[PDB]
Amino acid sequence: DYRKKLLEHKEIDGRLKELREQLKELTKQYEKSENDLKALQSVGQIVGEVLKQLTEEKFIVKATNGPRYVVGCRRQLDKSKLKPGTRVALDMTTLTIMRYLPREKGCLLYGPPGTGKTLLARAVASQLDCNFLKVVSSSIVDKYIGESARLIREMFNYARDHQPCIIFMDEIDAIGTSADREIQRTLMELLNQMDGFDTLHRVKMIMATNRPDTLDPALLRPGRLDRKIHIDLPNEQARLDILKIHAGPITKHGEIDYEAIVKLSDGFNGADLRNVCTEAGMFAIRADHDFVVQEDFMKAVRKVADSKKLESK
Amino acid sequence: ILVAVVKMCYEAKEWDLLNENIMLLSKRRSQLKQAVAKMVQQCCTYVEEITDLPIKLRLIDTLRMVTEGKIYVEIERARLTKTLATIKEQNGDVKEAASILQELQVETYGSMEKKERVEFILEQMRLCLAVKDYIRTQIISKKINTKFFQEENTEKLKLKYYNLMIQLDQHEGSYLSICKHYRAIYDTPCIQAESEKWQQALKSVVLYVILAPFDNEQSDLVHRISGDKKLEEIPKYKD
Numbered sequence: 001d002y003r004k005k006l007l008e009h010k011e012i013d014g015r016l017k018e019l020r021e022q023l024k025e026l027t028k029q030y031e032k033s034e035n036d037l038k039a040l041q042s043v044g045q046i047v048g049e050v051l052k053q054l055t056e057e058k059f060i061v062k063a064t065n066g067p068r069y070v071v072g073c074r075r076q077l078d079k080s081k082l083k084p085g086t087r088v089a090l091d092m093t094t095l096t097i098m099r100y101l102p103r104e105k106g107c108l109l110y111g112p113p114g115t116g117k118t119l120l121a122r123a124v125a126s127q128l129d130c131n132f133l134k135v136v137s138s139s140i141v142d143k144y145i146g147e148s149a150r151l152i153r154e155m156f157n158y159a160r161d162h163q164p165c166i167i168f169m170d171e172i173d174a175i176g177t178s179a180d181r182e183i184q185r186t187l188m189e190l191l192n193q194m195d196g197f198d199t200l201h202r203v204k205m206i207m208a209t210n211r212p213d214t215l216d217p218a219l220l221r222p223g224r225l226d227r228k229i230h231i232d233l234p235n236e237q238a239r240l241d242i243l244k245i246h247a248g249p250i251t252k253h254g255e256i257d258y259e260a261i262v263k264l265s266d267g268f269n270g271a272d273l274r275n276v277c278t279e280a281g282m283f284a285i286r287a288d289h290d291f292v293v294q295e296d297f298m299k300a301v302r303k304v305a306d307s308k309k310l311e312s313k
Numbered sequence: 314i315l316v317a318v319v320k321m322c323y324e325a326k327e328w329d330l331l332n333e334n335i336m337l338l339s340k341r342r343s344q345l346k347q348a349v350a351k352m353v354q355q356c357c358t359y360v361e362e363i364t365d366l367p368i369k370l371r372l373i374d375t376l377r378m379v380t381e382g383k384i385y386v387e388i389e390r391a392r393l394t395k396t397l398a399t400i401k402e403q404n405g406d407v408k409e410a411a412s413i414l415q416e417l418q419v420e421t422y423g424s425m426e427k428k429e430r431v432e433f434i435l436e437q438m439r440l441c442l443a444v445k446d447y448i449r450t451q452i453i454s455k456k457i458n459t460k461f462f463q464e465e466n467t468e469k470l471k472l473k474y475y476n477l478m479i480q481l482d483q484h485e486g487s488y489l490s491i492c493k494h495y496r497a498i499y500d501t502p503c504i505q506a507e508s509e510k511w512q513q514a515l516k517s518v519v520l521y522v523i524l525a526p527f528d529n530e531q532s533d534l535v536h537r538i539s540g541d542k543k544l545e546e547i548p549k550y551k552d
Contacts, residue, residue, distance in 0.1 A: 112337070212337075228340060229340075229342070230339060230340050230341065230342075232339065232341070232343075233343065
């Protein structure tokens with residue numbers, strides 16, 4: 001009688017305290033709506049550019065529309081950003097200044113036997129890349145007279161202005177008569193913009209190929225590609241490691257042997273082995289089952305891996 | 314029976330005989346570490362006491378192979394020269410100091426070594442007690458404290474080597490050497506027992522603040538030690 005009223009009142013108090021969470025969560029967004037409505041009150045700002053400064057307090061601005069004006073100095077800002085050469089912003093009323101407006105070393109990994117080192121660059125880039133800047137070898141067609149020097153200086157200039165820069169060159173065998181003159185031009189521009197006062201600590205590039213006879217003996221010279229590593233054995237220990245730490249979320253049959261799948265899928269990379277196991281998952285999802293007999297797994301390994309070996313031209 | 318003359322002559326005279334006919338440089342660098350590791354392993358099992366005559370020719374040959382190689386993980390190359398340097402410590406010949414300390418710079422640049430760099434970096438200040446060259450000390454705590462504060466280096470005895478690092482600069486310098494040394498030993502009592510820290514840590518906790526420059530560091534450096542309960546327990550608190 002008396003002992004049950006505590007549990008019952010605890011239930012009424014429970015269902016009474018479990019209804020506040022359905023409102024106190026959305027009240028923060030509702031108040032954020034009026035916060036934004038109070039944040040949209042700063043309107044009417046324009047831009048400008050500074051070329052010549054006569055007085056330290058008052059300088060000349062250049063608007064984007066074409067007409068030029070002159071503004072003053074606001075009591076809040078200082079003379080740090082007031083120096084010329086920095087794009088600033090202006091206001092429609094009194095032409096005050098609220099704030100400014102900011103404008104906007106080598107490793108070779110080639111394997112004489114087999115192909116797929118571009119997929120090794122996909123393995124390293126899929127492991128830890130953190131810098132997205134890709135350059136394709138099909139942009140140096142040079143069907144014009146030939147002026148890729150400013151393309152190299154402008155590309156690496158955008159690599160200086162853009163801190164994230166990790167490149168992965170690939171398919172260089174088809175671009176490697178005057179067929180070599182452009183290679184000596186672009187490569188000598190690479191030396192001219194890599195051996196001087198260049199930011200080598202920020203730029204990074206990886207060159208890939210497909211054949212051991214077209215290795216570009218100019219690229220084989222030191223300098224351009226200092227760190228050279230052959231691919232004769234595709235890192236069976238690192239392949240097994242990639243399979244172990246990349247075979248987590250994929251569910252397969254209970255009886256699974258990693259050494260057999262590693263040995264039956266070699267030559268290219270361990271991330272390609274991950275593509276073979278995720279391909280076996282792409283067939284197990286077609287067979288609407290989580291775990292299946294390894295016969296279909298051996299069909300993905302033999303048929304898909306050997307299809308990579310045959311169609312890997 | 315073992316003469317070891319023909320043994321050292323076979324490999325000493327035949328290094329790249331198979332690598333001169335093959336025009337395709339394979340640059341394996343995969344079984345070379347296992348081959349050199351097997352050579353230093355067998356020589357490690359036959360390095361204690363076998364025969365004193367061939368060991369000087371084998372060592373004088375492999376230390377030249379260190380320079381002739383120029384491409385390695387820089388682990389065995391340091392292994393042979395430090396296991397030779399340990400023999401040169403009790404051998405009484407300190408002339409090899411320029412060799413070990415000159416080649417150490419080559420054996421520490423060009424690769425990424427975290428644990429081996431600290432275990433092998435003690436040779437910089439090991440024979441320095443016998444050398445006592447001021448310019449060498451100026452070149453090498455400079456080359457020692459390049460980029461390392463706390464991380465990527467674990468042992469246990471870290472504080473002991475920390476005391477073994479700048480105390481020699483205290484022997485070379487007079488007072489400024491401990492201004493930046495005695496100010497970083499506040500974490501030492503936290504790692505080990507605080508019983509023995511009263512004699513060394515809580516004693517050297519006042520030397521750097523007394524010998525601190527009188528311009529600016531005296532104003533703010535006195536507040537880092539104030540507030541500690543163990544400070545008032547020292548009879549020197551009144552001083």
